A paper describes a structure:
In this study, more than half (54.5%) of the subjects had the [name] allele, and M1 protein-derived peptide H1-P25 (M1 99–109; LYKKLKREITF in pH1N1) with [name] restriction is 1 of the 11 peptides. P25 is conserved between H1N1 and H5N1 (named peptide H1-P25) but has a dominant mutation with substitutions at position 9 from Ile to Met (I9M) (named peptide H7-P25) in [name] and H9N2 and Ile to Val (I9V) in H6N1. To further interpret the immunogenicity transition at the molecular level, we determined the crystal structures of [name] in complex with peptide H1-P25 or H7-P25 (data set 1). Peptide-MHC (pMHC) structure determination indicated a molecular basis for the immune cross-reactivity between pH1N1 and H5N1, as well as the lack of cross-reactivities toward other AIVs, especially [name].
In [name]+ individuals, we confirmed that peptide H7-P25 could induce lower cross-reactivity than peptide H1-P25 only in pH1N1-specific T cells. Further, the [name]/H1-P25 complex was more thermally stable (with a melting temperature [Tm] of 48.8°C) than the [name]/H7-P25 complex (with Tm = 46.4°C). Despite the fact that the I9M mutation is not located in the traditional primary anchoring positions of [name] I binding peptides, peptide H7-P25 displayed a minor decreased binding affinity for [name] compared to H1/H5-derived peptide H1-P25. The overall conformations of main chains were similar in the two structures. Another structural variation is contributed by Lys4. Although this residue is conserved between the P25 peptides of pH1N1 and [name], the salt bridge formed between Lys4 and Glu8 in [name]/H1-P25 is not present in the structure of [name]/H7-P25. Without the constraint of the salt bridge, Lys4 of peptide H7-P25 in [name]/H7-P25 is exposed to solvent instead of being partially buried in the C pocket as in the [name]/H1-P25 structure. Due to the low resolution (3.3 Å) of the first data set from [name]/H7-P25, we collected another data set which had higher resolution (2.3 Å). Taking these data together, though the H7-P25 peptide has only one dominant I9M mutation, this mutation influences the antigenicity of the peptide, most likely by altering both [name] binding and TCR recognition. In the structures of [name] with H1/H5-derived peptide H1-P25 and H7/H9-specific epitope H7-P25, the I9M substitution influenced the solvent-exposed surface and decreased the force of anchoring of the peptide to [name].
Residue numbers in the entry:
A (entry chain B): 20 to 119
B (entry chain E): 1 to 11
C (entry chain A): 1 to 274
The structure:
Amino acid sequence: AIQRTPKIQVYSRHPAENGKSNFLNCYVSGFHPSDIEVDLLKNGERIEKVEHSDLSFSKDWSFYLLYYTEFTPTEKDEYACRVNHVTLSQPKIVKWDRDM
Amino acid sequence: LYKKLKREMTF
Amino acid sequence: GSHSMRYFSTSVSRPGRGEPRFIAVGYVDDTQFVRFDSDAASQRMEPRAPWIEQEGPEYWDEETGKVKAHSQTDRENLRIALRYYNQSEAGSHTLQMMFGCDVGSDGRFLRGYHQYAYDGKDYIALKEDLRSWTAADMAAQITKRKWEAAHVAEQQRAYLEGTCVDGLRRYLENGKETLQRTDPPKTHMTHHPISDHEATLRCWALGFYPAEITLTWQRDGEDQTQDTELVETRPAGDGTFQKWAAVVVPSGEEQRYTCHVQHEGLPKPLTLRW
């Protein structure tokens, strides 16, 4: 029952413009087993309406999921992505960079 | 178009 | 150019919570089209692509009948495997399954795939010659000996070549708008100091389809893969994809570096310099 730590990437769909409607994507990949919990945060608070893509895997049998939500960033607002998995001693939180 | 094995075969 | 269509099946047991969970998704190249979910209340194959919503209900009823047949096949496949390996039923185990076919630029058959994986490792799979099976462990040799005697390799070969290809052929017509397009990436560099003696050079590729791409860094025309950080290609969510690679460089030696991008939608590969 092999295990894989997920590769987390948080990012905007289009390069961010403050006050313009974008999509926030958190993309986890290369993990195993398949059960995973992903949340999206605004200043540390979980975002309610969030859809995820369908469960699929790559050629190496490693799963990848895409959690996405529509949002309009500001200068102030902090966003992040929180992922827990059986391979993680604690949930890992990834803050969204405009340049990543 | 999904696979259909006429007689479904298991391990 | 060449094209591909794949179905990915994932089954997971949940011992205290009852029946295993089955999830299957269709793909043409990097574009998803259908999906199916065991726990979904619809209990039907659902379109995830706009160009496949036009199919008649005769189509949907046929597909949703076969995917349910596979779902219960894998549910019993899981029971056989917990027996085969003698793992306790308290544990939760996974069975992944993939099948599909490839075609050339003109549409002729190229390759085919029929394979399973148990708990992330290869269990069984169909060889490229499509007359034989590769079986890792002695549990899979049993199923191999089962599937050889039942002539399974011949029936799937008929599917893969006959049915898998013809469906891919109509899909590539139905979706000519989206599928057969190729989106060139929009590229640029970003510069991010860390110390006063160092800086970070990042080379971006944005909004490209298909997702297959090659990113490269160089110094004076010589390849730098030593210091390179390169992220896995990520879906943009709109149907396109994004990727970037980065190197830490001594400041101010920057224009001494070049970034090189290759993609199908590019007539010639690109060279970016700071």
